[PDB]
Design an enzyme around this catalytic site. Sequence first.
Site, mmCIF file in Angstrom:
data_model
loop_
_atom_site.group_PDB
_atom_site.id
_atom_site.type_symbol
_atom_site.label_atom_id
_atom_site.label_comp_id
_atom_site.label_asym_id
_atom_site.label_seq_id
_atom_site.Cartn_x
_atom_site.Cartn_y
_atom_site.Cartn_z
ATOM 1 N N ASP A 139 0.808 -1.203 0.000
ATOM 2 C CA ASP A 139 0.000 0.000 0.000
ATOM 3 C C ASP A 139 0.841 1.253 0.000
ATOM 4 O O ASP A 139 0.388 2.321 0.389
ATOM 5 C CB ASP A 139 -0.939 0.011 1.220
ATOM 6 C CG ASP A 139 -2.110 0.999 1.065
ATOM 7 O OD1 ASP A 139 -2.454 1.405 -0.065
ATOM 8 O OD2 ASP A 139 -2.671 1.323 2.158
ATOM 9 N N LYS A 142 2.976 3.592 -5.539
ATOM 10 C CA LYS A 142 2.396 2.589 -6.420
ATOM 11 C C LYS A 142 3.460 2.065 -7.392
ATOM 12 O O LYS A 142 3.398 0.896 -7.775
ATOM 13 C CB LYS A 142 1.124 3.127 -7.105
ATOM 14 C CG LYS A 142 0.071 3.695 -6.084
ATOM 15 C CD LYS A 142 -0.197 2.822 -4.873
ATOM 16 C CE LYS A 142 -0.895 3.582 -3.774
ATOM 17 N NZ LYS A 142 -0.827 2.856 -2.485
ATOM 18 N N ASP A 167 -3.262 -3.023 -2.562
ATOM 19 C CA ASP A 167 -4.287 -1.985 -2.663
ATOM 20 C C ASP A 167 -4.089 -1.154 -3.943
ATOM 21 O O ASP A 167 -3.003 -1.026 -4.480
ATOM 22 C CB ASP A 167 -4.251 -1.047 -1.455
ATOM 23 C CG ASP A 167 -5.421 -0.155 -1.355
ATOM 24 O OD1 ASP A 167 -6.499 -0.536 -1.815
ATOM 25 O OD2 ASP A 167 -5.358 0.948 -0.725
ATOM 26 N N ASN A 168 -5.149 -0.505 -4.382
ATOM 27 C CA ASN A 168 -5.044 0.569 -5.376
ATOM 28 C C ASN A 168 -4.593 0.117 -6.748
ATOM 29 O O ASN A 168 -3.972 0.871 -7.514
ATOM 30 C CB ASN A 168 -4.103 1.687 -4.889
ATOM 31 C CG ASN A 168 -4.534 2.237 -3.575
ATOM 32 O OD1 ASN A 168 -3.750 2.248 -2.608
ATOM 33 N ND2 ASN A 168 -5.779 2.757 -3.512
ATOM 34 N N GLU A 197 -11.534 4.212 -1.238
ATOM 35 C CA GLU A 197 -11.954 4.551 0.110
ATOM 36 C C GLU A 197 -12.784 5.866 0.097
ATOM 37 O O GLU A 197 -12.389 6.868 -0.468
ATOM 38 C CB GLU A 197 -10.730 4.700 1.018
ATOM 39 C CG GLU A 197 -9.612 5.595 0.498
ATOM 40 C CD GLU A 197 -8.510 4.826 -0.192
ATOM 41 O OE1 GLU A 197 -8.741 3.816 -0.856
ATOM 42 O OE2 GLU A 197 -7.337 5.300 -0.095
HETATM 43 C C1 LIG Z 1 1.762 5.770 -0.834
HETATM 44 C C2 LIG Z 1 0.653 6.168 0.153
HETATM 45 C C3 LIG Z 1 0.669 5.424 1.476
HETATM 46 C C4 LIG Z 1 1.914 5.589 2.377
HETATM 47 O O1 LIG Z 1 3.071 4.945 1.780
HETATM 48 C C5 LIG Z 1 4.220 5.570 2.333
HETATM 49 N N1 LIG Z 1 5.352 5.211 1.522
HETATM 50 C C6 LIG Z 1 5.669 5.623 0.205
HETATM 51 N N2 LIG Z 1 6.748 4.991 -0.249
HETATM 52 C C7 LIG Z 1 7.196 4.218 0.823
HETATM 53 C C8 LIG Z 1 8.324 3.352 0.921
HETATM 54 N N3 LIG Z 1 9.202 3.140 -0.062
HETATM 55 N N4 LIG Z 1 8.487 2.665 2.082
HETATM 56 C C9 LIG Z 1 7.580 2.899 3.055
HETATM 57 N N5 LIG Z 1 6.499 3.693 3.100
HETATM 58 C C10 LIG Z 1 6.313 4.324 1.937
HETATM 59 C C11 LIG Z 1 3.810 7.064 2.254
HETATM 60 O O2 LIG Z 1 4.659 7.882 3.104
HETATM 61 C C12 LIG Z 1 2.312 7.045 2.676
HETATM 62 O O3 LIG Z 1 2.152 7.303 4.074
HETATM 63 N N6 LIG Z 1 -0.638 5.881 -0.433
HETATM 64 C C13 LIG Z 1 -1.180 6.633 -1.429
HETATM 65 O O4 LIG Z 1 -0.590 7.600 -1.953
HETATM 66 C C14 LIG Z 1 -2.590 6.357 -1.845
HETATM 67 C C15 LIG Z 1 -3.278 7.290 -2.641
HETATM 68 C C16 LIG Z 1 -4.606 7.166 -3.040
HETATM 69 C C17 LIG Z 1 -5.242 8.170 -3.904
HETATM 70 C C18 LIG Z 1 -6.355 7.809 -4.712
HETATM 71 C C19 LIG Z 1 -6.994 8.779 -5.487
HETATM 72 C C20 LIG Z 1 -6.519 10.087 -5.433
HETATM 73 F F1 LIG Z 1 -7.150 10.985 -6.128
HETATM 74 C C21 LIG Z 1 -5.438 10.471 -4.673
HETATM 75 C C22 LIG Z 1 -4.809 9.518 -3.902
HETATM 76 C C23 LIG Z 1 -5.322 6.090 -2.485
HETATM 77 C C24 LIG Z 1 -4.664 5.150 -1.675
HETATM 78 O O5 LIG Z 1 -5.375 4.130 -1.137
HETATM 79 C C25 LIG Z 1 -3.320 5.278 -1.382
HETATM 80 O O6 LIG Z 1 -2.767 4.254 -0.699
HETATM 81 CL CL LIG Z 2 -15.131 3.113 2.195
HETATM 82 CL CL LIG Z 3 -4.536 2.336 5.621
HETATM 83 MG MG LIG Z 4 -4.087 2.600 -0.533
#
Ligand SMILES: C[C@H](C[C@H]1O[C@@H](n2cnc3c(N)ncnc32)[C@H](O)[C@@H]1O)NC(=O)c1cc(-c2ccc(F)cc2)cc(O)c1O
Ligand SMILES: [Cl-]
Ligand SMILES: [Cl-]
Ligand SMILES: [Mg+2]
Length: 213
Positions: A139, A142, A167-168, A197
């Site tokens: 998650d 992407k 996810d996604n 979501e």
């Molecule tokens: C990527 C994020 C989730 C988290 O991932 C951490 N992260 C990153 N890279 C790394 C790494 N390499 N290692 C560890 N952690 C890491 C980050 O700091 C965020 O807290 N999730 C999303 O951006 C995300 C976006 C959408 C979304 C959908 C429609 C829209 F119009 C706009 C946004 C929906 C979702 O369900 C998501 O999950």
């Molecule tokens: Cl929902």
């Molecule tokens: Cl979550």
């Molecule tokens: Mg997600």
Amino acid sequence: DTKEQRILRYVQQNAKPGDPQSVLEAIDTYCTQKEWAMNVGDAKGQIMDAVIREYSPSLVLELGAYCGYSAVRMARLLQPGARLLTMEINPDCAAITQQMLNFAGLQDKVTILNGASQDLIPQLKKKYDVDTLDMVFLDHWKDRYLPDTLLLEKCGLLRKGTVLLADNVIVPGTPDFLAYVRGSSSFECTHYSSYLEYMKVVDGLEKAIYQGP
Ligand SMILES: C[C@H](C[C@H]1O[C@@H](n2cnc3c(N)ncnc32)[C@H](O)[C@@H]1O)NC(=O)c1cc(-c2ccc(F)cc2)cc(O)c1O
Ligand SMILES: [Cl-]
Ligand SMILES: [Cl-]
Ligand SMILES: [Mg+2]
């Protein structure tokens, strides 16, 4: 303060300490009524729950904790002694996730690691005493789903039967990852159609079961 801080404060003030379900409800209410946030949500979260109950994993790895919603969701259904390790690169969000777990009473079941998945994965065996993983929830960013899947395999962290749940895969989408797992004889894949979501927008989860080399 940030959106994430507001979510945490809302939970602290509208949920019951030690009650994970109340925490999830609070987050879902805030995200529906106040401010959207990228938690996996109730729609996809119900599918996740069904997968966790089917496999009863003893060791789960999560990539991209955010505020800890999914970590609460998974950890509340783990059997006694089972464990979740979750990674989050953003230090502010890692601290929110820790505090969210602490409030839920799940802190003994979950380790939240602050760092990038590509740096931490190669440490799991020697530093975190991991043999192989039973399940991985992807998650994070992407475009990292595919490289980190390949990294997990290279590090010897996957076994026959390991469940990847992503996810996604539709929004924002992970097209290289989906093409890869769907075309690989090393995975058996299933698509679970759902909704983004808190939104009337189609999204989905992909389950990819690792079959060995
Ligand atoms: C990527 C994020 C989730 C988290 O991932 C951490 N992260 C990153 N890279 C790394 C790494 N390499 N290692 C560890 N952690 C890491 C980050 O700091 C965020 O807290 N999730 C999303 O951006 C995300 C976006 C959408 C979304 C959908 C429609 C829209 F119009 C706009 C946004 C929906 C979702 O369900 C998501 O999950
Ligand atoms: Cl929902
Ligand atoms: Cl979550
Ligand atoms: Mg997600």
